[PDB]
């Protein structure tokens, strides 16, 4: 068959407020999303979002379901379940947990179900607690997956490893064209399709259609990537600063001295001074691999040499993305070293564009 369009969510919570944390989802967030892009879909990955956050990103997702669409919602985090009603945890939940604060599966699927799309796929890869077990308890295209672990531990050792992501699996072997560890953990998948349908499909293409422009456009304005910038420095010095994005809401920045002048035989240069509500802690920026700032992306597919900082949690910036290159310089023969600074703004990258 044809996909009319092929749209995509990815949601990974891990940074969690009063649960504990888990570290698994960026991976497999990751993983998926570049499947997924090699699939032809336009994707949006967002890690650790608040109740907030998640439902105006799945609201705005949903409002991509149309009529012959192909539509794939992926959550890992934490999850819970209360009488046959599954819940996707966001990252500010408090503990205990409740229904109030979370994001119900079950009225997620049941808006799915209603747009007459040509594929719905909705993947859940939950952490649950340890004692809560599924209860006692009395359409379109579509494939449901839900994955549970109990436990962090379970969780995390079942998930340790590159590329074993369990609906990673599933898509490759089953919608195209991991050893069992310790603990309790389960897998339910269930389907229903009036005809076959594969994430494979083409797209039904079009060369003059405003839907499709528009729906493009949408995607793309939360996906510009600041234009990457050199700076002068007044006493001859140039720094390069470029971008890459590791997410929709992760940009990795990285900061390389191009050249020093004659009379400048030592130099340093760093950034500083981002926005507050990004949180950024200076001991994670500044690296010299970007594996250290805790990035998927490495020292050889980000280019060399540099200092890298990522920036994580760009949905919160209120305003600018502002910050400070600072640089340090030294003269031929002298004594000390002499700082200097440049302000930049570097405006709303990515999802920040969103401004929610
Ligand atoms: C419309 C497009 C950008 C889109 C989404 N949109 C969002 O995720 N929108 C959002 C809207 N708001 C906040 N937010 N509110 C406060 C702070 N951040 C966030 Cl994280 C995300 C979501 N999923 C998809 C898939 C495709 Cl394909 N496109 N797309
Ligand atoms: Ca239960
Ligand atoms: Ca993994
Ligand atoms: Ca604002
Ligand atoms: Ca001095």
Redesign the pocket.
């Known amino acids: 068959p044809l996909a009319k369009d092929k ?3 990815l949601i990974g919570n891990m940074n969690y407020r009063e649960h504990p944390k888990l570290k698994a989802p960026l991976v497999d967030v990751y993983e998926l999303t570049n499947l997924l892009r090699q699939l032809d ?4 990955s ?1 890690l650790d ?1 608040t109740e ?2 998640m439902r ?2 799945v609201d ?2 949903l409002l ?1 379901l149309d009529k012959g669409v192909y539509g794939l919602l992926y959550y890992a985090g934490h999850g819970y379940e209360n009488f046959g009603n599954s819940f996707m945890v966001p990252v500010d939940a408090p503990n205990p947990y409740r229904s109030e604060n979370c994001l119900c599966v079950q009225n997620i699927l049941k808006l799915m179900q209603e747009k007459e799309t040509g594929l719905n796929v909705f993947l859940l890869d939950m952490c649950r607690k340890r004692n809560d077990y599924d209860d006692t308890i009395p359409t379109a295209n579509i494939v449901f997956g839900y994955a549970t672990c109990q436990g962090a531990e379970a969780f995390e050792i079942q998930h340790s490893g590159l590329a074993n992501g369990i609906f990673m699996k599933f898509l490759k072997d089953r919608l195209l064209e991991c050893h069992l560890t310790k603990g309790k953990q389960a897998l339910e998948i269930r389907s229903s399709l009036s005809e076959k349908r594969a994430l494979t499909d083409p797209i039904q293409g079009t060369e003059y259609s405003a839907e499709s422009l528009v ?1 493009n456009l ?2 793309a ?2 996906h510009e990537l600041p234009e990457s910038m050199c700076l002068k420095f007044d006493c001859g010095v140039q720094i390069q600063l470029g971008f890459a994005a590791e997410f ?2 992760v940009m990795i920045i990285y900061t390389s001295i191009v050249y020093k002048p004659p009379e400048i035989i030592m130099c340093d240069a760093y950034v500083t001074d981002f926005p507050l509500d990004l949180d950024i802690d200076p001991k994670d920026a500044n690296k010299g691999t970007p594996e250290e700032t805790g990035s998927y992306l490495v020292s050889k597919d980000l280019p060399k040499h540099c200092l890298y900082t990522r920036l994580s949690s760009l ?2 910036l209120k305003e600018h993305l502002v910050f400070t290159v600072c640089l340090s310089y030294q003269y031929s023969g002298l004594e000390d070293t002499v700082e200097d600074k440049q302000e930049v703004n570097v405006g709303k990258p990515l ?1 920040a564009k ?1 401004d ?1």
Request: no cysteine.
């Open positions: 749209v995509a969510l879909f336009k994707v949006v967002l979002l907030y956050e105006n990103a705005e997702f991509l729906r949408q995607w304005k939360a929709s809401n949905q919160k999802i969103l929610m």
